[PDB]
Subunit: 477 residues, 4 copies
Amino acid sequence: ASKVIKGGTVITADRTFRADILIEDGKIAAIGDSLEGDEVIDASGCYVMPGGIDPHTHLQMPFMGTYSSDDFDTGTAAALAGGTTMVVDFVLPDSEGNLLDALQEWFQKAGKARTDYSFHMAITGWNERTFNEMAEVVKRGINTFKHFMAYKGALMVNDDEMFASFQRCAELGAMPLVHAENGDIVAQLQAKLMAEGNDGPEAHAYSRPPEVEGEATNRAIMIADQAGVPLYVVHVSCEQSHEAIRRARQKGMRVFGEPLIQHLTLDESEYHNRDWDYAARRVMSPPFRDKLNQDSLWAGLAAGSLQCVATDHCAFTTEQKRYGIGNFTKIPNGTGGLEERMPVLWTRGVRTGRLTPNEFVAVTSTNIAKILNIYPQKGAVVPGADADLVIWDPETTKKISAKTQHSSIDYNVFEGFELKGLPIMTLSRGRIAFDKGQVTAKPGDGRFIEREPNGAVNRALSQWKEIVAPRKVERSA
Amino acid sequence: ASKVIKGGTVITADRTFRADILIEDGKIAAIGDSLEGDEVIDASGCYVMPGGIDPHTHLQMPFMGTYSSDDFDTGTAAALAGGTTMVVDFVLPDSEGNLLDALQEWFQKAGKARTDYSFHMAITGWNERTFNEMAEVVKRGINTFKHFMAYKGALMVNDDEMFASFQRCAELGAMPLVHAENGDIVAQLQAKLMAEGNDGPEAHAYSRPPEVEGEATNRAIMIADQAGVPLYVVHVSCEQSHEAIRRARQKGMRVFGEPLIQHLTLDESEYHNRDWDYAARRVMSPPFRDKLNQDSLWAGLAAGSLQCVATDHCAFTTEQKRYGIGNFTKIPNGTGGLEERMPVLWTRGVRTGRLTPNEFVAVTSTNIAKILNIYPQKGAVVPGADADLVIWDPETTKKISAKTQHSSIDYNVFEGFELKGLPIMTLSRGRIAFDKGQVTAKPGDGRFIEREPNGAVNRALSQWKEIVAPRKVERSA
Amino acid sequence: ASKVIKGGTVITADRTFRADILIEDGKIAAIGDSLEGDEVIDASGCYVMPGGIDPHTHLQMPFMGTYSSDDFDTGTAAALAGGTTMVVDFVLPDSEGNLLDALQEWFQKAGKARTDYSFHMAITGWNERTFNEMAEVVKRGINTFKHFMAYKGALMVNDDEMFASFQRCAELGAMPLVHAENGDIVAQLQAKLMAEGNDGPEAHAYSRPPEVEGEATNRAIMIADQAGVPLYVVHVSCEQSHEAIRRARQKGMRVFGEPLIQHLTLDESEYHNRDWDYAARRVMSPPFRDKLNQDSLWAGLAAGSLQCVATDHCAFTTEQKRYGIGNFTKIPNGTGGLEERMPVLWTRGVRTGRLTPNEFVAVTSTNIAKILNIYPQKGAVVPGADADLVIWDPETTKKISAKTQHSSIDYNVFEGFELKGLPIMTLSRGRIAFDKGQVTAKPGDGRFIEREPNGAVNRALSQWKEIVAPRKVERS
Amino acid sequence: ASKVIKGGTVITADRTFRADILIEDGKIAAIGDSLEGDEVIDASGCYVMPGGIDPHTHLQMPFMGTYSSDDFDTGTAAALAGGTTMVVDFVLPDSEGNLLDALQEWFQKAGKARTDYSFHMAITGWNERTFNEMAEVVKRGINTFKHFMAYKGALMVNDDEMFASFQRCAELGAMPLVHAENGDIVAQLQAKLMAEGNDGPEAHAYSRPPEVEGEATNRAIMIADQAGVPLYVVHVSCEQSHEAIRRARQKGMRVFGEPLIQHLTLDESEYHNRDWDYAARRVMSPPFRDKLNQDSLWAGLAAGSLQCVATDHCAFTTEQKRYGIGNFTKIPNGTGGLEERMPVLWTRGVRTGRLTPNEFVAVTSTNIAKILNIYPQKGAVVPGADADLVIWDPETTKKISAKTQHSSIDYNVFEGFELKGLPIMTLSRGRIAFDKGQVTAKPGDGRFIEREPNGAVNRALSQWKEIVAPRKVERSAEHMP
Ligand SMILES: [Zn+2]
Ligand SMILES: [Zn+2]
Ligand SMILES: [Zn+2]
Ligand SMILES: [Zn+2]
Ligand SMILES: [Zn+2]
Ligand SMILES: [Zn+2]
Ligand SMILES: [Zn+2]
Ligand SMILES: [Zn+2]
């Protein structure tokens, strides 16, 4: 039974045009002037875009013997209600390198996904087991490996481990991701701040100022380039890390950057709210920054030095945040934004002219699809693509509120944002997944998306590195 | 009578995939797994790409009562043999502002074109007539206006004129192009050099060092941004001008940059060749630069801070170059590259891994088509696009030589370049235009391509300027 | 009759040390542990620094058939009360190039000076007379020529004229100064804002945003470097112009930058004050900028990418400012800061640790003395130097107020600034010029300081340009 | 017995002027138009400048159970013959942190010094002993601590150790120095190149390309600025590390940079010379770089973003260099330049107009004197200063050659440099220490120069950090959960 989306205006990363869309067997069958189908969906007056891909989520993430509050069920509901049809989550193995066991456990979690998903595999140590299982992980359809330069004593790896891992990535045709903050300096700053009685939520930001992110970003870049592999920097929050990426790209290094919607539109003044709960709720890493940083990130999206908007979705209830009363290091880090990502970006970015509608599509789905090597299966409006689509009414308005959010927690860091232009229908592989304010996709409707290694940028870089490889001088006896 | 291109691998700016291409009525009718057509073109083992678009040509350009040696006939022949299916030439009006008259004169020239073409309209003065005829020029399908900051006493405009013209561009939804060298400093350096007996071809480069281009680029950007209109900088030849563009883009300014294939692969040491003819042949503006500048331009293409490769094709005979014997200011400026642009870029860029094949397509056709607002009619492999296509054999080799070039002049500045990967067939709106080393397109086969004003980037920028427009302070009596 | 300053701590651009200073015949005769002299000045608990040099003033400047309200009398009074012992003013000739005639008129103005002074010569056009008279100006002891890239129809020169003039500067061993704003773009923005009814004081700032200054700074640098002459950019107000200077210097170009004390400590929010008078009073060029720019300028001073703090002192009464009611282009541009420069810089810069005390001396006197080629006659505490000195009590406090200022106008843009550490005595060539809150130097006490052309940086740059000069290829 | 230097032209960092100089009791007694003294030294037609200060030497440095070949005797002879009157060497303790024991050993080495000297104290690990002895090291008159980010398994410290040490420096009013190369990445590149048979001298440069230095520079700066202490980056060899310093200074961070005379005038093409010995002799860390980097360093000296020229003097014989035949990682790292520093800089920098003569004085003595807090005792021509002076004949010429050098090794990486303008006499505390090509100062004539902590820049930075220190938000119980 086919669907035809009629009367809409298609917006993709490359063009905007009036067209009908015929959907058969979960895929786009045809795009053209007048199409017929068994079931008609009216998109008159609306835009039709690829469903959003959010490459950065932490659904049901383990914390202190419990979990974050949004799991793959409520998380994907929030995603769908915001026009996002795919999430990419981070698998977190132990330092022993039980990558495959951790993967199995994340598959169990993701069984509740209401829409399609994939994984990044984190690397939280280095040893022979880790080295071997990375090969198998790539065979299972995961082509990215996430590294933490912070979280000393938990997730952190050092330069030595990171270089070996990046080289293994290069070898497998995978691409490293990095959380770039200097973990040694943050740990000492945390301890010093706590020792001085500087223990409130605002001190979380004090313990990891922008220079600490800027440095680690620069270092991760050096190591990836030495290893001959592209690098993806997650949650680029400030001018210091953005500058490191621009400078690397101008040297011809292959580096991608991902600003969070939070860092595009929220700022550190939130931590100076007189209410402890209010300030603690906004604690995440990297923290909200000086507002001046926002323009840098926006300009990067427009200039192409930053490519993907994400949310780092990790939602905790007020009760969970309160674990850090009297100690900011015990406030669970994370704010949720899955539902808010595309709508906030549309109002703040497209309606203001900071982004063309086409750039909007590029930085919400198409770019990350290309970067993770699943374009055009995802992030595309072309025949043969998965029919993951959002129907966007440019005229509808709302005020963001915790009272109406699909996320399970009791607050919303975008509380009060005035929006115009909203997702009114979301389709996941041709199925109506969100409609008339209701999430219609059921838990288990989502499936794992396998990804192939050795994307175009990996291959070009490897070829170039071979060209410029330094050679031994031939010397007579 | 339809054509089907079978067995090939399609490369576009966004993806690479095996597919057949059905062509009907000069357009791409279908793209898919197995297609049939009246006539079969075998593309087994080959890549199929959008035909190149070269936005920077000067065919049959007036110089000293004569003309450049390549006209629209030989010019488009060379283009087609090099996989380029469209050229964009510059109409050069008198300073009185006889834009429409100049346009008619250029249509007469382009009657000989063998493949499709369009125009930029130059603005060489400022007055009421110019202001008025700009509106009429836009109605006739030209949405770009070219400005010269150098060539004092002939083409040059000042800051005042340039600002007025840019504001008019903003109003009409057109985009200014700029030749950015400081004309006043250049004229004085020329005169000082001649007065000192420094009168050889190498002194042309001396008379306009990179700082002179860097300054003018920076100034034109300021003025475009103040007028609220995007800016396209032609022939970005050096790091100083590239740096100005990167810095502007990081401020959120809408600026495009165009490196010439000459400046990517050739350098100023050519001017120090002992043979006068050899050095003079290479004289153009901006001149060939210190070789160190090339890596900057290549990185710009990979990073997206530069978007389009062109040739500034303006070919003169050795006899014409010799008009400047004893006086370098009288050496006609220009080198030809229409045929060599895509082949040299492929060998130097794709085969080395500096550019992915998709980036190659982006910077040889798709980007400029989008920028000139003619995507997807041109620069696309999508249904409904003009069937302007090149069939590329990645294994064929040749050495570039004047003896085999299609340009009418007696030398080739890319002489001796070893290539691998060549255009073996070129189609212009579904017609075989180049095949088996022969240009099969006839003079008059080319048609003028009209362009609409107010593309997406123009619209976004105007919207943004309105939002940040400074407001009067309300003061009570 | 000798003077000895006893018990103080000397602070110079290069060091800090306890020493007595013996003054004879208007000069520093000796510096050492224990000295005696005919007359004793007690500097116990105080710092002794070279008197400030403000390289940027416009005293009795011609405007609209009148003049600015602070002349060389009240202006040097203000300077002295702020620890500044020398001003450098701008001679403004007509565009016909009557440089010598204008110079004579400025000598008449400066007859009222209470402390020493020198001149910059502005170049407001280009022609044979201008080219010729520049040589004679250099012979008269002025080794700097000021160029305006803004003020279209009045002071402005174009790239062609500026290049010719800069080449003439190089030839004479002079150094160009530049007011860098794009005059063509500013004139058009002014007209547009006025046509749109955007006619308040705030639109003055709107008519010349930072990008316009950044561009012109960048262009002027290119032209000086092509001419092979060092360049001095006056009133670097924003990160865009500062960036152009840093980038140029890293290319090995010889460029100096001068942030005004206003742009270090005041910002554009002043223009949005609801009171029209309040906002109009702060109108100057370049305008007060977004506060974010302050950090860039401060860092430049500490890093050495900016070398001299000045005031661009050009004072108008409220009545004069009101000439621009309903039309911001008619508000006379300028604020006064002569008295406030060193004291504000001390509190905001030294007491905060943004500048070491030695850096404070460098950016208020020694650097500009060196740049204008009058070191160590001025800006120094060495034997043989002019005894131009300020005795600074680091503990005394005050709140800046128009009620206590020596400037003749009725307001103070630094109103309410809380200070600690103040000039308590100022000496000009050994004469007590400021003491007990009173200016004791008389009008006419000031003397013209002549300057030699061809300073060290001019000579080094010329030598280098000769080394790297492009040569003809020898062809049979 | 007084000396008067007559007829010369004084050049200092701040001015150039004709003056006589009267010297009494090892110090400058007076400067003026015509002075009289017991013994007259004729400086007619010559310049008189502060004697050079080279803040970066490794004389008789321990390596592989032996030592580098220039000790404090021949090292200081070389210095003096090049117009340099003071060297600053690096004390190298074991990782256990036996700083005082190491200091005593270095005093034994420096007993042979012919001209004055001082020390930097290296920190090669972190622990309680190290923390404690740093305080005593500062009390002995050493106010700098050197950190190595490279030389893994030998001298290297990590970010954690470096941050603790930088904070201790801040506390004591000391200033850290850093050798900034990423040691972990260098060690892995070394192993990779060796495994691939890329084992020649040129592969030394391959194993630590400029990005590896630029990264570590950027990192050391971040850490120093977080600790609230100024940082001195030794041997800034390339644009990447130079850019990191410029960017940091523009953020208002207090960072100094030191380009070596080698990196200003020599380049990596030397490693591709066909002769193994020739290439290996030039091996040092950081290696000679792409020639393009030179202009960046020269501009930094002229712009003030780099402040001091040094040599990293560490001299090995050809026989010692040959320890690395078949394995570039075993080639002892270091080249000598003590004698060549000021003369090469004068010809390449002053005679070309890249530096004014005054800037030449700044970057060869006065800046480092100020930075190490011993101005005006050293690096100055003012009354009361130590009479450490060089008399410079701007017209005399020579070509640098191993056959005439005062360094003890058998080659010279500045071989063939054509010079004009040379020191013809060097005075150390008023004693003629070098004259007419002869080193006249004897071993033991040099004395240790004590330095005080808490220089002006340290104090200003600490004050600024206090001003901008982030404060706890005051929250009433009304606003608490
Ligand atoms: Zn993270
Ligand atoms: Zn995360
Ligand atoms: Zn051109
Ligand atoms: Zn052209
Ligand atoms: Zn001005
Ligand atoms: Zn002024
Ligand atoms: Zn070292
Ligand atoms: Zn060393």
